[PDB]
Design a protein around this ligand. Structure first.
Ligand code: ATP
Ligand code: ATP
Ligand code: MG
Ligand code: MG
Lengths: 8, 35, 243, 243, 26
């Protein structure tokens, strides 16, 4: 994946 | 066989709690709009 | 009464609810027959029937054998009639057998007239086949199973529900704004919606892996309590016969 | 290449994934056609097609019209072919039309031969109809969509998957021991399970109510990035044509 | 790592008779 954090 | 509508949107746009929901979601608004 | 359960879409929980509701009705002292009318033949696995047990009412009928020999006892007050296991060719060409099963309808009518069972529950597919339509036509009442999501919302505006069906919500989540918005809209507009619903519950995901109905598997689960509420509602409202 | 997507059962996410994957491929600069082969005609609503717009390839064909007139352009690199809206009478008598749609196959083959599209994605039902079998046969590659639960586990042992399909998990959840146990078993026993999966994601629940594909609706949602990894895997593995 | 995967699977099959049934008849 591009990031280890995503929208919540 | 004839029946009255199973889904009834009469006066839906006068329930204030539903106003924000219909503005949030175009899918819901398009069924509930007057014809 | 003969009660049909049918999902508005696949995968909404129809079979788990049918098994759970049958269990609750027999716990309340009713004699219950539960019939699987779905060709995937999954209902039997909620009652610890071996996967390699191939027999069932439709399997027997298609083999030229006696469907009445395919019933199984689960408790003294709950009997099960599996569909039976279809071959891949039968699965891929259902038009070849979907018009060969009409005799189950006269048989179920005779079974209803016997008074042997207070409740006959039928797990129905949604495939618009001849046999599904015929089985629906002998139900006194029916439940249309939904989840609160945009797919089911659309479907309710474009496909037929069984005549006189009430809508039962399953898989209701905690903490979803779009779900709450759809639900609040349904409360104001869907005249067929039942006043109780079934929450998403790990017990309902686990019970099939344990090969049990949910109320036997975990009687203190929220979903089990909600099913019991549904059972009591059916006793009060769905006990009358169609004229 | 023609890529078919078909759920192992209903409601597993096939249509939402088809729309999302089409969006991700066109975002990567591929020319995409996305075809709805499901008679429920739901794919179009992920692309802001009005519910009352009843045109589609099957609607046109049943009406004696040219199915090519039903195409819609979403971006310069993504075209859409809705199924079209069936009446209740048509829905309840599927055999009166399920054998009248076979001209779509040669039509889609001619469109494929033009070179206009690098991807033709087909949202397939699993209703065992003549037209479904014929459209699946057009596909160079296929994805079988599952959720990790006991129902899909049983189905994998008793029904056919599309020939050569890889398996894509959707709706993967947290806090579920039974899911974790089934998943660990599948990792060892399902050779064609894809290395990426799609989590249960609130953006995937909202995007249809917003009438958008998930990656357009919320590009930084986890599911959007997982679909992007799926798109990149397709570019590397599914770009070839069947022999 | 190899035996670690086999031991976790053993526990899962013991937890769920449906999974044990299908694994044992493959
Ligand atoms: N309330 C619930 N909470 C959690 N999981 C649920 C719930 N209801 C059903 N499930 C799970 O969802 C899956 C599908 O359930 P089920 O087999 O009852 O659906 P169905 O509508 O009969 O599906 P099919 O279209 O295959 O007939 C099962 O693995 C079940 O454990
Ligand atoms: N990963 C996900 N997380 C959360 N919600 C999801 C996810 N995938 C799908 N959904 C929701 O689940 C519902 C069913 O999804 P979808 O219509 O894609 O399923 P399907 O398998 O195509 O169903 P059908 O049997 O009607 O063809 C939709 O409301 C969608 O928004
Ligand atoms: Mg079922
Ligand atoms: Mg779909």
């Amino acid at each position: 994946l591009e990031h280890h954090h995503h929208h919540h | 066989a004839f029946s009255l509508p199973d889904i009834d949107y009469a006066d839906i746009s006068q329930r204030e709690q539903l106003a924000a929901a219909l503005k949030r979601w175009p899918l819901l608004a398009e069924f509930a709009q007057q014809k």
